[PDB]
Design a protein around this ligand. Structure first.
Ligand SMILES: CCCCCCC/C=C/CCCCCC(=O)O[C@H](COC(=O)CCCCCC)CO[C@H]1O[C@H](CO)[C@@H](O)[C@H](O[C@@H]2O[C@H](C)[C@H](N)[C@H](O)[C@H]2NC(C)=O)[C@H]1O
Lengths: 171, 171, 171, 171
């Protein structure tokens, strides 16, 4: 019934992100969502996750030389979502074919033999519903696992197994 | 005008590869080589390695819908090099910025907690030496680990540790 | 295969096409689409365009000796798509290398100094979407300029600039 | 900024439409499609037809005081479809009972003693199929004539007998 009717996100300033230099935009409404995992260590507190988001971005910006952390959003096990490039900026998370047409959300950690806590799954699914309500994502958007569009084990066997059951999943 | 027959490479026909639909070419001499691992199961016999190469290609062609296996060459633990897209066709292994200026060689297996056997490493260095002798690679080519140009664990912790010591490795 | 017959295409019979003698088939689904221009006269009415398509086929058949108009489909400035050899038959528009693995669509007119009207651009893009829907083209098909696969001016500088901005365009 | 709309519909702005002031919405997917003729002048080219859509709109807006042209979509004899109120906005073409539950498509011209060209009929069929793909029309919708729901000879005797032969028509 009123404008800002969706999910909470930790803003860039809050997790002390380096300023983005990316300018290429995505065309909303976006149809695809690609779920990946950072494949590294997980975090489970606002404190550790903010730090983890800073490290992921550092690697992408410092080492890979990218304009900003590749993901549009990051999901910490603290149950919070971390603002990446956002709903309107093209990400670098699934290749030249899917980057310009999807939203890349990455779960912080490695989920090959471990599943994310319920609160992390709720945060991600709450975020997608937020993207629909805002008009950032199509009402009939499609969820893919990173390994469905790129050769990689991401988002991890256990997590990949989870998203396959999701309402919007379409391999 | 010197022609060296230093190719102990297993032809696509020999490992029963599906025909390639790729047509884009690489401009020789190529300056970079990006080393990755398939992060899948490894193989130590010509027979099992031809089969694993088939699987890797099947994943890329049938699941990802690609023209061919993304790597220019694959390295088996059987100590043999398996022909991928070859020296002249641009591969799909390190992104839009690196694919067109590099040769991607991938070790079949996951090297986070395993090192490839000496014979696999010998195969890879001999393959790169052969590339220089043919004119396909610059004599002063630079080797990069996959994780140095893209966010990923590839080529695995132990293998990455090994290639960082290589003469041609560059930050 | 899939219920929806897609897009509005002017049937061969409607533009008074000479019967085709072509028999070689394409392998479904097709990966490539080569965009060309006829470099001939443009037409902006259903009548003038049915005539020009007849003229193009006439030149190809009667003067070049081809089994039919070499293009799989023709686009008119009248905003309609004119059926050539169709989705299932191999055309003659990009040479011995590409003809066997691509769909050739051609805009009727010379676009070195002119751009095709928006209706022609929309007709071309919906035809392709239709090809994908029909299973004739791969979901991840790639669009190429005629100049990218053969040494030619086709499809003309102005049109070439436009197809480069297309989502499925790959240099 | 991505690929354009299906059915190759000439956008409002392309046929130089006055801005719409309508707000009442239909709840897609819609169950009915009512076919009428404008009983106005006919046109057979993109230029003439854009002018006629302007004429029809001008009459409904300037003279009848409507928020926009009554029809959701207009079909020209040039074989193109012209965007009227579109898929989401309730039209004014079949009265208070039928306007809120149907999509109204109108053939530009008088068809009492004339049949519209095959392409105009194809554009109409193509428009309806693209409505389902978009999710605006019920995958299994129903088609009615103007005289089947209102006391009028619209869409004309000739055009009326043709739509009766359609596969989605309902008594
Ligand atoms: C200039 C012309 C180049 C093309 C010449 C080759 C002709 C035909 C090749 C096969 C087609 C590939 C392009 C279209 C495409 O299917 O995209 C891929 C997405 O999967 C799917 O659709 C799955 C369909 C299922 C969904 C059903 C609707 C990946 O995206 C890929 O696109 C490019 C080429 O493959 C690569 O540069 C890119 O590089 C890299 O390649 C490496 C695998 C690397 N590890 C990286 O992952 C990638 N780069 C980045 C930055 O992520 C790669 O991931």
């Amino acid at each position: 019934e009123d404008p800002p009717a969706c999910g909470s996100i930790v803003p860039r300033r809050e997790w002390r992100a380096l300023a983005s230099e990316c300018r290429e935009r995505l065309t909303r409404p976006v149809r695809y969502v690609v779920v990946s995992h950072t494949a590294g260590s997980h975090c489970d507190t606002p404190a550790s996750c903010a730090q983890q988001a800073q490290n992921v971005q550092s690697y992408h910006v410092r080492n890979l030389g990218w304009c900003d952390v590749g993901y549009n959003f990051l999901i910490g096990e603290d149950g919070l979502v971390y603002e990446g490039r956002g709903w309107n900026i093209k990400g670098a998370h699934a290749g030249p074919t899917w980057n310009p047409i999807s939203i890349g959300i990455s779960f912080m950690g490695n989920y090959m033999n471990r599943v994310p806590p319920p609160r992390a799954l709720r945060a991600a699914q709450n975020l997608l519903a937020c993207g629909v309500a805002l008009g950032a994502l199509r009402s009939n958007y499609e969820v893919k696992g990173h390994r469905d569009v790129q050769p990689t084990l991401s988002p991890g066997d256990r997590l990949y197994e989870i998203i396959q059951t999701w309402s919007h999943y379409r391999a």
